[PDB]
């Protein structure tokens, strides 16, 4: 299962962003198909609840090559916001987890993709979005 993770991390700018990837420690396009070779770390697509997306091919077969082969992509449209980190350490978004311009959908990598949200307050959310009851946490101001 863990093989479905794009680890094309090349810290060329020497910024050391990978440090916060492994442990915990400041001043709008829709989600489609994204290649895994330009992704470093897990991909989190944000429905009402945060869902982790794995590495597959063009058809959806789960590939276990760590995103090394060019046939590895992420089908963000099949989970219909999504965020991910690129090879050089940039939070590439599409639609991300900002349901409210003041809040943010919490997930195990909220502080790594959005470091300026550490001082945010968590809240318990319950709502029937499309008939399905989703339970998740937010991060407002």
């Amino acid at each position, epitope marked *: 299962h*863990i093989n479905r*993770t794009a*680890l094309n*991390c090349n*810290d060329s700018l020497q910024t*050391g962003f*990978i*440090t916060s*990837l*492994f*442990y*915990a*420690k400041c001043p709008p396009r829709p989600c489609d198909v994204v290649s895994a070779r330009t992704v470093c770390g*897990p991909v989190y697509c944000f429905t009402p609840s945060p869902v982790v997306v794995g590495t597959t091919d063009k058809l959806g077969i789960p590939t276990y090559n760590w995103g090394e082969n060019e046939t590895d992509v992420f089908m963000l449209e099949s989970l219909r916001g999504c965020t991910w980190m690129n090879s050089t350490g940039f939070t590439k978004t599409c639609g991300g987890p900002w349901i409210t311009p003041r809040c943010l959908v919490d997930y*195990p990598y909220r502080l790594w993709h959005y470091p300026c949200t550490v001082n945010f307050t968590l809240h318990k959310v319950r709502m029937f979005v499309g008939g399905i009851e989703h339970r998740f946490d937010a991060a407002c101001n």
Partner: antibody
Amino acid sequence: LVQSGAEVKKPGASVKLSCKASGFTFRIYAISWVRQAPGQGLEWMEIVPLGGITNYAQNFQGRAAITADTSINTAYMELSSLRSDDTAVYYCARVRTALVGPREGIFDFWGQGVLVTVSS
Amino acid sequence: IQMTQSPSSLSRVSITCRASQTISTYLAWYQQKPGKVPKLLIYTASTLETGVPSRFSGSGSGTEFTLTISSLQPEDFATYYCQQHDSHPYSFGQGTKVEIKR
């Protein structure tokens, strides 16, 4: 996961300690080293995945240098400028990561343990 | 960051592990027998490691944590160390020696 052999060296020298990895991914899990003096507690001398992340302890940050070099998943360990109190058994343990591990980093599996004696 | 265990020597019984700074439940416990390798028991103060007997329980949060054991089997008399795995540097404590009584 197997360490190197027991070594005995005189003070003011350097010791190279090796390790290995089998049955898990080397990039994800970090590889740590633990010191235990004879008849005393466990010392936290630290970790390095092949992603290039290293964070030593305050006391050992000067002379301890842990390099990954994932050629055959070695995770070497070189400790220069030895002293009499450095006589202790050294371990090569797997510390977890916030990627696959449930928390920041836990020593779920440990090494056989290599004895290093420093005396003139 | 500093750690300290309350029971120096031990002879149902529990072991204490107090920190100097506050930690929101990120402590691990370990068992080491004299001559063998340390073994993980609990890795987040509450959840025990898979394969550890259910008689090994853990409670506590914040500055003080506890390792609660009820049944004392012959395979349990050893030294027990607690580890802090919240922030760097990771730090252990002076292990408590659980000795037999006769």
